[PDB]
CSV table of C-alpha atoms in Angstrom, one decimal:
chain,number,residue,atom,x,y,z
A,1147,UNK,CA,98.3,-25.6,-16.3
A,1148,UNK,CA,96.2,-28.5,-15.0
A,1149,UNK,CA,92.8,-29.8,-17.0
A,1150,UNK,CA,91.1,-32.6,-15.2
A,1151,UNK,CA,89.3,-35.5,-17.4
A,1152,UNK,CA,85.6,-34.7,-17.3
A,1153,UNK,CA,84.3,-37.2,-19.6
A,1154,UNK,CA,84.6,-37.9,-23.3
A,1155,UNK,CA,82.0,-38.9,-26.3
A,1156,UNK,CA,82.0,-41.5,-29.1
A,1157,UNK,CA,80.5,-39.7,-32.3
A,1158,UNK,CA,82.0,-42.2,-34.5
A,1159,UNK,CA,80.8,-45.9,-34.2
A,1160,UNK,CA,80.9,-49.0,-36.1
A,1161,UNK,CA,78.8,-52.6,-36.0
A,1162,UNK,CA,80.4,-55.5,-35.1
A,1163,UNK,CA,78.8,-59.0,-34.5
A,1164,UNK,CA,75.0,-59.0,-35.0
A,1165,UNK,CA,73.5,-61.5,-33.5
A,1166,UNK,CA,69.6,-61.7,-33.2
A,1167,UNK,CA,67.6,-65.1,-31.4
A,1168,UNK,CA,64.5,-65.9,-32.7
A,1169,UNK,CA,61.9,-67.0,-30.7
A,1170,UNK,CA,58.2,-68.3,-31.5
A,1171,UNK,CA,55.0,-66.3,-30.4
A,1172,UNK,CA,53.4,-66.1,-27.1
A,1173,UNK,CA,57.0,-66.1,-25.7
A,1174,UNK,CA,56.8,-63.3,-24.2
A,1175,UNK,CA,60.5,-61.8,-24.0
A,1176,UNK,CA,63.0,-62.9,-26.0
A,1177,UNK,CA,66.4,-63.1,-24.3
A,1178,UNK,CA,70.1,-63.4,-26.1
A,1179,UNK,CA,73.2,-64.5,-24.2
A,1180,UNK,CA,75.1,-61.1,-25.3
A,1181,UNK,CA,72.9,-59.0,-22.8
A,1182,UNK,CA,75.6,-59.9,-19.9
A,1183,UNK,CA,78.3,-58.2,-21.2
A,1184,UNK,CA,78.1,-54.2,-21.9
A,1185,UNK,CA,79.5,-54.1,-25.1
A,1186,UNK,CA,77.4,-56.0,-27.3
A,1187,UNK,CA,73.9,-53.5,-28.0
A,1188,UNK,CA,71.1,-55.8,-27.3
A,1189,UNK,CA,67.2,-54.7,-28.1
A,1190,UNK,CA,63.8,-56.2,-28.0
A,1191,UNK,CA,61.7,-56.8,-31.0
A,1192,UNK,CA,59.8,-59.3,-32.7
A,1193,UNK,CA,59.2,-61.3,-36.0
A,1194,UNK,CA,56.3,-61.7,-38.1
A,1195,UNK,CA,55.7,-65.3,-38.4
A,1196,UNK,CA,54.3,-68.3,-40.3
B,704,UNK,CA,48.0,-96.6,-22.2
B,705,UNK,CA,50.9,-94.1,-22.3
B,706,UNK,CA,54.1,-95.9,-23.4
B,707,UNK,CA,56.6,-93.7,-25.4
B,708,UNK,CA,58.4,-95.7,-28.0
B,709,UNK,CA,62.0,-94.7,-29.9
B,710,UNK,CA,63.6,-95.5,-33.1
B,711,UNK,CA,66.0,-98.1,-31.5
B,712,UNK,CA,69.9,-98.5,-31.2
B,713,UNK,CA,71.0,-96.9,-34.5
B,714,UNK,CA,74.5,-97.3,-35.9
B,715,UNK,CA,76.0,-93.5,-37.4
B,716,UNK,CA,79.4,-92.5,-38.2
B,717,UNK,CA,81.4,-89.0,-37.7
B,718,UNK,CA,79.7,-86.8,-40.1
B,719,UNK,CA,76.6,-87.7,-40.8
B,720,UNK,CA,73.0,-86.6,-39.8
B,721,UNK,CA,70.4,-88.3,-37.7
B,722,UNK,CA,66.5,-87.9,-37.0
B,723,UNK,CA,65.9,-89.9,-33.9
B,724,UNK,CA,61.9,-90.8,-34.1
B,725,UNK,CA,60.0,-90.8,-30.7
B,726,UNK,CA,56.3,-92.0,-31.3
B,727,UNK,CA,54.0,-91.7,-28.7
B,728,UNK,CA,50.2,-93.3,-27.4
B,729,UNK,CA,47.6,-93.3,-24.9
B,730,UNK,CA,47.1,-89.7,-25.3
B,731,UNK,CA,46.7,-86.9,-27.9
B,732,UNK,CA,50.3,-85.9,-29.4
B,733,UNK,CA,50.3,-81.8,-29.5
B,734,UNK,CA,48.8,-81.7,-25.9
B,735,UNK,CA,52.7,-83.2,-23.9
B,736,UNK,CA,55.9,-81.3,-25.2
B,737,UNK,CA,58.5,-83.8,-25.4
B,738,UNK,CA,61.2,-83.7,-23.0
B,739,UNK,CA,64.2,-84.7,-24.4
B,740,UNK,CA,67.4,-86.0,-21.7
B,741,UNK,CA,71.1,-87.6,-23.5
B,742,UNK,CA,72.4,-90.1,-20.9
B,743,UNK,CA,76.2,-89.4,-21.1
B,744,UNK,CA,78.7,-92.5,-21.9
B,745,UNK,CA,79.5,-91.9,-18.3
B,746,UNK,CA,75.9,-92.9,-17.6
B,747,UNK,CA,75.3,-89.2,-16.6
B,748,UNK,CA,72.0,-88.2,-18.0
B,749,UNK,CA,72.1,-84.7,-19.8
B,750,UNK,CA,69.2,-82.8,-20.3
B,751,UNK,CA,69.0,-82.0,-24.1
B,752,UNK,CA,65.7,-79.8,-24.0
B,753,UNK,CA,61.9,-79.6,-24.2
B,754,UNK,CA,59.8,-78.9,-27.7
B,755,UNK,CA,56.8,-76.6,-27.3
B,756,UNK,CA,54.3,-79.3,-29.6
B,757,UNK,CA,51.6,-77.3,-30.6
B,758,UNK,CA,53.3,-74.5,-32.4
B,759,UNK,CA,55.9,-77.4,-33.0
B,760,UNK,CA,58.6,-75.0,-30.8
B,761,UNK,CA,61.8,-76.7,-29.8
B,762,UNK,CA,63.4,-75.1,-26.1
B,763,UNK,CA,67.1,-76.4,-26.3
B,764,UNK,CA,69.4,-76.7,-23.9
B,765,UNK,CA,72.4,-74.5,-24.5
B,766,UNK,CA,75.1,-76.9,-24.8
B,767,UNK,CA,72.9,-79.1,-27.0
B,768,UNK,CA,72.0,-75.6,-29.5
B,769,UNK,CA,72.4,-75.7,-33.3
B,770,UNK,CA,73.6,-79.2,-34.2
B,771,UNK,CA,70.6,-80.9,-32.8
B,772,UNK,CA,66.7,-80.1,-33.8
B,773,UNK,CA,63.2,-81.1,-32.4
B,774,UNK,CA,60.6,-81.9,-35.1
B,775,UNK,CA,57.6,-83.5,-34.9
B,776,UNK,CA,54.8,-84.8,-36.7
B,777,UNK,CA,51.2,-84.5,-35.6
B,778,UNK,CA,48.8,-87.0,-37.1
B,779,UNK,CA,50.6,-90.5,-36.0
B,780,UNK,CA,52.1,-88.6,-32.9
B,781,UNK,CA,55.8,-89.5,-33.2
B,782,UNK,CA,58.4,-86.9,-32.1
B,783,UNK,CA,61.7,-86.5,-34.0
B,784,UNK,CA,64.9,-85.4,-32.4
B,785,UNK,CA,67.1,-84.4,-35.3
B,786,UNK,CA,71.0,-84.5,-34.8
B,787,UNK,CA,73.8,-82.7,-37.5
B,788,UNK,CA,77.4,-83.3,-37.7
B,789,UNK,CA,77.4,-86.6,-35.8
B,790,UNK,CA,80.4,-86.8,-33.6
B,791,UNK,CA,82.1,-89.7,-31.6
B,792,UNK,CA,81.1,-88.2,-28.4
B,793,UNK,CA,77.5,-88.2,-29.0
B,794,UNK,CA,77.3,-92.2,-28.6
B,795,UNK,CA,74.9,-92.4,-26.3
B,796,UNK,CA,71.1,-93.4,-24.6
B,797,UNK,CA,68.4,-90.8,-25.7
B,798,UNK,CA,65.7,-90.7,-24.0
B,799,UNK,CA,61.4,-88.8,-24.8
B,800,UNK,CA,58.7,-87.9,-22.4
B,801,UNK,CA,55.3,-87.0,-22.0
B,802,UNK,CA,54.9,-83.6,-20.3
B,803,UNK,CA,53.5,-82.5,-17.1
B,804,UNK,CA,55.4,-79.5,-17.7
B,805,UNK,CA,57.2,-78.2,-14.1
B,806,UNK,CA,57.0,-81.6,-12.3
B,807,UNK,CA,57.7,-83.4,-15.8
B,808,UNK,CA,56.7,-86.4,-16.8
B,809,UNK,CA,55.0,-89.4,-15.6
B,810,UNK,CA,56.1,-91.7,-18.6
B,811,UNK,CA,59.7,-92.5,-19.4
B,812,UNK,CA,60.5,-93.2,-23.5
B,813,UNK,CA,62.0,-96.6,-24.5
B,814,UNK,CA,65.0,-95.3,-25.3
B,815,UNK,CA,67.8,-94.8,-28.3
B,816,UNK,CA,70.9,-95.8,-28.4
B,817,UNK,CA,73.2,-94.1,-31.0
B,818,UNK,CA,76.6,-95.3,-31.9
B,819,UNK,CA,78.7,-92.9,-34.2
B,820,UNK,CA,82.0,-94.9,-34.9
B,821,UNK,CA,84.2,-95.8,-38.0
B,822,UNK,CA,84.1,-99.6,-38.4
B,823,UNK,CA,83.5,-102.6,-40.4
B,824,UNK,CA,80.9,-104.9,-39.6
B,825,UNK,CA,83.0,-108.3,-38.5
B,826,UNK,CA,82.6,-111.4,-36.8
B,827,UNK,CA,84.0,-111.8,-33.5
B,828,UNK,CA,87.0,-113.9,-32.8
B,829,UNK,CA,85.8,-116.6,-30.5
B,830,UNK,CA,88.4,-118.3,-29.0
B,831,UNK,CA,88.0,-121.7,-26.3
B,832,UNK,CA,90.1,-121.2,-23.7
B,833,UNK,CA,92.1,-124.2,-21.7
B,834,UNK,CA,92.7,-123.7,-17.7
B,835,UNK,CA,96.3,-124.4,-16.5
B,836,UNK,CA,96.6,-126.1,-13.3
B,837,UNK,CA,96.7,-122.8,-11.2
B,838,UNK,CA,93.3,-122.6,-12.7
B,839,UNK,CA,91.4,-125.3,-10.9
B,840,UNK,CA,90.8,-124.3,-7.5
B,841,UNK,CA,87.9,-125.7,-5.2
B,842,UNK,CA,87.0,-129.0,-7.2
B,843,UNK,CA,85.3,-126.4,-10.3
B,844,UNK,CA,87.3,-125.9,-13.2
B,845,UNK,CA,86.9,-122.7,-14.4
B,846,UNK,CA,86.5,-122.5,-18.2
B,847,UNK,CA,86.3,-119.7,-21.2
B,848,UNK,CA,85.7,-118.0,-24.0
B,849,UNK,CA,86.7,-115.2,-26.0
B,850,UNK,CA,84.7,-113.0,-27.9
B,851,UNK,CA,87.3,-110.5,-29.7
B,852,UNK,CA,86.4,-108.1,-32.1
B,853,UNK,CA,83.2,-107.9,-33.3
B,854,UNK,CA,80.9,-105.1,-34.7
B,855,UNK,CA,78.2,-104.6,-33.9
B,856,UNK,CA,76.6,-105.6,-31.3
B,857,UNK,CA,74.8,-107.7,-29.5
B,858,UNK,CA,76.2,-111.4,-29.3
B,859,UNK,CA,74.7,-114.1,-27.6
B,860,UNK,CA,77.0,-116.2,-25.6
B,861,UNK,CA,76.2,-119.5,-24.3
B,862,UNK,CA,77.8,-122.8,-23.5
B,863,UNK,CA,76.2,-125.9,-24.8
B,864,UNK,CA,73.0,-124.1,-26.4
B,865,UNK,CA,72.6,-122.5,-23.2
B,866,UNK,CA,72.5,-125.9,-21.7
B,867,UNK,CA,74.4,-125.1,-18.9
B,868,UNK,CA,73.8,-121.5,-17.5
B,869,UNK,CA,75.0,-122.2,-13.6
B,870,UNK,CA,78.7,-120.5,-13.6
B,871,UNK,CA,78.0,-118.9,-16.6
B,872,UNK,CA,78.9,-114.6,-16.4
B,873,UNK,CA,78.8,-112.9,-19.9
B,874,UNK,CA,81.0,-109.7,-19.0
B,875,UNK,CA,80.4,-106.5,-21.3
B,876,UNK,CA,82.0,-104.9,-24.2
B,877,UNK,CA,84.0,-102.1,-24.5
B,878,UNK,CA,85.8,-100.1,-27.6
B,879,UNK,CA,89.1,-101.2,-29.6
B,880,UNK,CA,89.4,-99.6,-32.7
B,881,UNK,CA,85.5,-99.4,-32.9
B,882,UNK,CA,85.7,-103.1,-32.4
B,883,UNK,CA,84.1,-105.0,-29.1
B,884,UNK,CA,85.7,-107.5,-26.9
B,885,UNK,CA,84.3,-109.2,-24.1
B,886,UNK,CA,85.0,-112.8,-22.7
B,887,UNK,CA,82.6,-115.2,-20.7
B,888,UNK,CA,83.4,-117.9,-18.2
B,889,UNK,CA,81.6,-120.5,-17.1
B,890,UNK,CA,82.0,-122.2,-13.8
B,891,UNK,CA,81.3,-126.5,-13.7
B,892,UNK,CA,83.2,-128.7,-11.4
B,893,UNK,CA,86.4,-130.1,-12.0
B,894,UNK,CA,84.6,-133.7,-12.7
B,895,UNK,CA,82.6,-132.5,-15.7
B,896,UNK,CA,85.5,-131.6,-17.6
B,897,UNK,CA,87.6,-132.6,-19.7
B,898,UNK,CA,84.6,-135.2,-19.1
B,899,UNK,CA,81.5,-133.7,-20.5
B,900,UNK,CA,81.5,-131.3,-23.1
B,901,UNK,CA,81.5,-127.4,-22.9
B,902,UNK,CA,81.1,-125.5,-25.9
B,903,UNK,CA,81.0,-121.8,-26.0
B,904,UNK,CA,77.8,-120.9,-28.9
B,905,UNK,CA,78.4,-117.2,-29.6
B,906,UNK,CA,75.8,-115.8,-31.8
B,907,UNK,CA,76.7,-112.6,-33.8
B,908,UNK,CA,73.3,-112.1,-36.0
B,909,UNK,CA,74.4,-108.4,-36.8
B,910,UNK,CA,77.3,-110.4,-38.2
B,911,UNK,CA,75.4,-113.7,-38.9
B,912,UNK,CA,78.2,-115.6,-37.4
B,913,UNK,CA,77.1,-118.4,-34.9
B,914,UNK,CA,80.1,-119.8,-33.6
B,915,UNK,CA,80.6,-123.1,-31.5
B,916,UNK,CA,84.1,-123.6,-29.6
B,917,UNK,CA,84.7,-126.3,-27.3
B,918,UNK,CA,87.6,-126.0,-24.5
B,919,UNK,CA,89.8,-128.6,-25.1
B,920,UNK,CA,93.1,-130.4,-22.2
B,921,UNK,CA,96.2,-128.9,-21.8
């Protein structure tokens, strides 16, 4: 009769808005505006540079 | 000595690009970032941001991000704050410094003034201006000129070749249609004139208009 809501799962996703700040060497962290809100994906990394 | 020098006042219109030069001495160039502060038109002083110098790494200030740069150039140690897509707003006082990182700086950059308007170069409308009779009060007459319309600055008002500087008071300029207006007065007693002359001599070299206008009886 009654089914509670347990939870639910995204298998399907899609990209929207990449956005990646570049930052010089010996920085240390690199930090993009996007990491306050929840729904933009925001990782660490680094660039090669010149 | 450390004395930070600027490109100086710079004239720009809506659109265009700028690199503002700051050149430095006293010291060696890649060893002080340059700190970089916009003095608003409200004569509020807006921090634009800091270049890392060695590494050549500019640290904006969010609000100032992506249409402004910091470039440099080592070997004559002169600093370059680039600007893109000049806009009316940005007219304005920028300012260099030598840093001393989190207490900043001990030396203050000469300064650059940039004006982004839309007008034609023109020679001001000087105009001598005759006191009424409700216009001599305490035994001074009061006399005037007009400076109307010019671009761009500066003029150089005075009375009589600067002769006569006592009640002088050369009041600013502001904006009409990207033209300046300001007026000066000078103050001499009521028995020096009509009786000894009192010509206004406004000097417009961006112009190259020197204008003489003597205040003549009602």
């Amino acid at each position: 009769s009654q089914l509670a809501e347990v939870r639910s799962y995204c298998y399907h996703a899609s990209v929207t808005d990449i956005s990646t700040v570049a930052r010089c060497p010996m920085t240390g962290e690199a930090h993009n505006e996007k990491r306050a809100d929840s729904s933009y994906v925001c990782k660490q990394g680094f660039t090669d540079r010149g | 000595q450390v004395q930070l020098m600027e490109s100086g006042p710079e004239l720009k219109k809506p659109g265009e690009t700028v690199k503002i030069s700051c050149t430095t001495s006293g010291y060696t160039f890649t060893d002080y970032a340059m700190h970089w502060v916009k003095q608003a038109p409200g004569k509020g002083l807006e921090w634009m941001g800091w270049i890392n110098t060695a590494t050549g790494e500019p640290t904006y200030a969010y609000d100032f991000k992506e249409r402004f740069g910091f470039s440099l150039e080592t070997s004559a140690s002169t600093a370059f704050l680039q600007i893109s897509n000049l806009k009316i707003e940005d007219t304005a006082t920028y300012f260099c410094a030598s840093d001393g990182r989190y207490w900043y700086f001990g030396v203050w950059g000469a300064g650059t003034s940039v004006t982004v308007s839309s007008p034609k170069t023109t020679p001001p409308s000087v105009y001598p201006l005759a006191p009424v009779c409700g216009d001599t009060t305490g035994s001074m007459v009061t006399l005037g000129c007009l400076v109307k319309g010019y671009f761009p600055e500066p003029v150089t008002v005075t009375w009589n070749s600067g002769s006569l500087s006592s009640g002088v008071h050369t009041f600013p300029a502001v904006l009409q249609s990207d033209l300046y207006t300001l007026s000066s007065s000078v103050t001499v007693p009521s028995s020096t004139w009509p009786s000894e002359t009192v010509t206004c001599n406004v000097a417009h070299p961006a112009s190259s208009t020197k204008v003489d206008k003597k205040i003549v009886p009602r």
